[PDB]
């Protein structure tokens, strides 16, 4: 009776703060399992357990050096074992999961994990394999543009002693051909996809502090109603600043409009700028509709709770918790209808 959620990521396994918002949305907290391997990429919550797709790796770190395959390459991952354990986890059967330690790089003795209330599979190939794609009850993939990704790499990963500035550009240029063919075309399968881009308000500075973000939601998905701005189906450009709400530079901008996303029908939600304070954070959330919120300001309370985390005031985290609440509403409707048939 468990629920499978797929999320693709490039930066790291659990490195994204996306997971911290989702666990907190539907759990008190999430933590690594007690005892066992100190490098276990698994996270355990009351209802949530995060699963690392890096663990289902056919080759150790030593093995891939003697081959042409990258970590993103399909041959390095074995989907045959991954699908077996997930299908066993779906029905409620205990599993044995190997561990890919990022430090040592050698496959460790397998850890066992019990079936969760909600299962999420973080990694790089949730929707790449067609067999696993059916098991997924929800598909998420956040697209990080090369300009903002390179920006994020410099602002956070340049401080390491060994790295040089142009050496970092040499890293993502090597990762681009493998990522473009094997990771990027997963955008069509994703039920909801978040793009991040440099802002158009300020003169295009690539620090990544204030970015431009679009939320693309597939329409027609069961137990899923897309968030809309003032009207479902129309095209709106709204700037919230004015007579009653006054805020400083750079500002805030929104764009709700329908779109065609790889022969699908979607409605996009764009946000460009950042939140200077609380007053426009409620003002923005108040006017949005189909939020799947239990009470007034639930989105604001979850963001202010996690404000110190990176990207909690620029709209990235705002759409992350909005998507996070949607998984909950998807979860509660689905288990209720399953219970009637059960």
């Amino acid at each position: 009776e468990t629920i499978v959620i797929g999320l693709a990521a490039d930066s790291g396994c659990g490195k994204s703060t996306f997971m911290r918002r989702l666990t907190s949305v539907f759990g008190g907290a999430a933590k690594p399992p007690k005892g066992g391997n100190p490098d276990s990429n698994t996270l355990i919550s009351d209802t949530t357990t995060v699963i690392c797709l890096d663990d289902y790796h056919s080759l150790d770190r030593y093995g891939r050096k003697e081959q042409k395959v990258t970590a993103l390459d399909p041959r390095a991952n074995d989907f045959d074992l991954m699908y077996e354990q997930v299908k066993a986890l779906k029905n409620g059967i205990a599993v044995e999961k190997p561990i890919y330690n990022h430090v040592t790089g050698l496959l460790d003795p397998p850890e066992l994990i019990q079936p969760p209330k909600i299962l999420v599979i973080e990694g790089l190939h949730p929707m790449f394999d067609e067999r696993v794609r059916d098991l997924l009850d929800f598909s998420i993939y956040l697209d990080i543009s090369n300009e903002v990704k390179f920006a994020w790499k410099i602002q956070r990963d340049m401080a390491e002693r060994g790295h040089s500035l142009e050496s970092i550009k040499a890293s993502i240029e090597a990762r681009k051909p493998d990522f473009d063919a094997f990771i990027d075309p997963q955008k069509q399968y994703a039920d909801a996809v978040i793009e991040v881009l440099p802002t158009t308000l300020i003169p295009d500075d690539n620090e990544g502090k204030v970015l431009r973000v679009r939320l693309i939601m597939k329409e027609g998905v069961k137990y899923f109603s897309p968030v809309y701005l003032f009207d479902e189906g129309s095209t709106i450009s709204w700037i919230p600043c004015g007579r009653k709400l006054t805020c400083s530079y750079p500002g805030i901008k929104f764009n709700y409009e329908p779109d065609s996303y790889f022969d699908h029908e979607v409605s996009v939600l764009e946000m460009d700028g950042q939140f200077d304070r609380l007053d426009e954070l409620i003002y923005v959330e108040s006017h949005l509709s189909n939020l799947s919120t239990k009470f007034y300001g639930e989105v604001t309370q979850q963001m202010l709770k996690h404000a110190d985390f990176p990207g909690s005031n620029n709209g990235t985290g705002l759409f992350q918790t909005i998507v996070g609440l949607k998984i909950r509403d998807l979860y509660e409707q689905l288990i209720a209808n399953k219970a009637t048939a059960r």
């Binding site: 081959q67 990258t70 790295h163 050496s167 090597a174």
Partner: protein
């Protein structure tokens, strides 16, 4: 940690000297990318413990006077 990052990134730079474009470069750069992310999570966990050592101490010893948290 960072010393093994420096060794990996030096050898990855030297491995690309033999081949401008090859599959050995993408092998060398993939490792360096994984090591840098590995150092980042170790850096975050070191910083996270320094502000609150007791919650890590209360992780192993919850019966001591500093660590007891009874409700009601």
């Amino acid at each position: 940690i960072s010393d093994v990052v420096e060794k990996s990134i030096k050898e990855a730079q030297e491995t690309c000297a033999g081949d401008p474009v090859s599959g050995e470069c993408v092998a060398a750069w993939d490792e360096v990318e994984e090591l840098s992310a590995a150092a980042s999570h170790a850096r975050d966990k070191k910083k996270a413990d320094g502000s609150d050592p007791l919650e890590e101490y209360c992780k192993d010893n919850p019966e001591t006077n500093e660590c007891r948290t009874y409700d009601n």
